[PDB]
Symmetry: C4
Amino acid sequence: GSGLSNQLAVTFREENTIAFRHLFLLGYSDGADDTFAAYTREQLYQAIFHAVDQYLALPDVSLGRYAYVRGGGDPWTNGSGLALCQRYYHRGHVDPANDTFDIDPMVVTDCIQVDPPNLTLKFHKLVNVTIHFRLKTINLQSLINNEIPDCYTFSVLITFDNKAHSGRIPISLETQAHIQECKHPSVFQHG
Amino acid sequence: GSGLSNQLAVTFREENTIAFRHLFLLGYSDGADDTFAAYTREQLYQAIFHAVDQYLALPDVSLGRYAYVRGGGDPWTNGSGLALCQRYYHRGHVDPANDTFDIDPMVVTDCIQVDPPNLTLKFHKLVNVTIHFRLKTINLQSLINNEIPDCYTFSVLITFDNKAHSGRIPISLETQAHIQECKHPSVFQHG
Amino acid sequence: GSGLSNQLAVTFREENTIAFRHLFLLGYSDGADDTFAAYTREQLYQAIFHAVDQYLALPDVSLGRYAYVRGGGDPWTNGSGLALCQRYYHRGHVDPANDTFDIDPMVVTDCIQVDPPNLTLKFHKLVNVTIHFRLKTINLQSLINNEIPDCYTFSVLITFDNKAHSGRIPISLETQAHIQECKHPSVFQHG
Amino acid sequence: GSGLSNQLAVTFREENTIAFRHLFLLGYSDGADDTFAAYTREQLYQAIFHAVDQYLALPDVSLGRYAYVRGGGDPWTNGSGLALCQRYYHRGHVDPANDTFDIDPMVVTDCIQVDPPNLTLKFHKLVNVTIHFRLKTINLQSLINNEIPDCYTFSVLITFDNKAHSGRIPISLETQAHIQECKHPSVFQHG
């Protein structure tokens, strides 16, 4: 009943999240979560594009059934499903060879909008790169616990964090889950 | 003698089972048991077919000597060695884009019979896919403990579980062992 | 001095042994010792041949300097460096399909001799396959502890164990070390 | 403030160091630090060259911004960025086949100088091979803790250790960090 309903819901959120890591993170394998990172530019660009591409090809490859979500204040412009954002110092003259730098640390955010069916990164002044998108899905497992399937909206955030400017960029994927009743649920139930 | 006979028997069952995982599970490696899963359709189809194909090519690749078993009530029709079954909701209209669904949760089981020497999966309404088959083998190790080799029948069940409808499908292989005396065992024993 | 001399010697034996596993065991990686095994015939033949071939190509690929050893009662015939042995039941009619077998458990050992610069395995009656060879090397590290380098003879035994007849064949490599003074050691030592 | 400043600095040093391992060590993966080693000559030469080449291509592949450093007494001749050194016994006649050796254990160091924009190893008398180079970088993360970015000089030492003459050559990368104020730091800071 209820204690089970909660565990099933948490489990549903974790399983989807694990699925998202395998689908969107290039070269991801279980147990690699806090070491997973990019070390070269090619790796980073390959990781960034693979994630956007897997987002576009989702209906054709995923074992789940997800609906795209469009709109919202940040940072999806209208019509937008995926936001590929770039944060860097407004001014970042960095010259270790002469032991100097000149910096305006105000952070600028450039975001590219991608609507569900090119990028020039600023490495020396890059704070980070994020990929934001939402996916909706029905929680069918509920039927086993004799409950009406729920309506989930997963907010997915992939972060390529360069805040340490260490030559190592850890990559992570996190999800927030908004749960509500579906508009029209119908489960035939007599026999 | 006897305490050893039991441990040897358990060990025999576990070793065969581990062998089955390496032979029938595509991409399997030790220590991956409870994380092993499919995340895309291609992976899933590739996993399903590899298992059936390895079953067909068994006599030509295995380091063991297994005999195929035919018949039985469920779910082998007569003449059948391997049953590839599919379980899905009788009715499963699932539309997250419009927050609705319409479901008849009665489970339907479609099984394909494969006789020892094409598949269309229903992802949005798929409960699971199973592969059932039996293999017989002689337990020769018994000779070391000065015992007459036993006759084992291994019932193998491979499950691709989609009950969580999470986008992640864990894959597992389990075995049940039926043990009995062989019809005619002969071990020359004088010298 | 002496406590160090012993640890250095043990360490020398372990390092060489670890090196032997990487050189002679096909697909070997650290930490895989008690799970390392073959599951198909191709794997097994590929493992067996790779070991013999690496033995033949040793002078051209190893980071160490090993001398081959010839002779000895078992199982090197004279002129022999490597013995590839096969043990199987003198008689092993094994027919699980009809639940019978007929066995003469006397073990027969067929060994092929390979002299430092084809195989037909009996799977259903195979007890095991071994590869035996000896390598000599000088223990130079001794110089650090101000000692005269030692003369080591490593007896290497690789076993592909099928005694469980489980479809799984664990593969292992073990070494015995015979240590003695070298015939003529000379370490210039004035400055 | 200060407790954070220290942890951030230590973390900065560790992250850069981890980055160096992924960039310069051929085939490196996390968690492999004390087992990482070469077992054949090809592996060793491939490891040595990959490290030098990655040093030369650094500006084009790294996610960080490093400046090369030239000069210094040991072992960079002037104009030198990378020193590829070789240490071996002045005299090392090693003949295990006849159980003898003749050695002059005085160590000779041959170093090749590489200036930022062929090798013949002596395996039987090789003590080790080292690769020494320095890289400078600005510690930008400091801005988060409202501090002026620091000027770091990383001294990188890669060691291919053959002192055990065991056939196994462990490979490691270590760093020393020299920290000082930058010549001219400027961080605009009003708004």
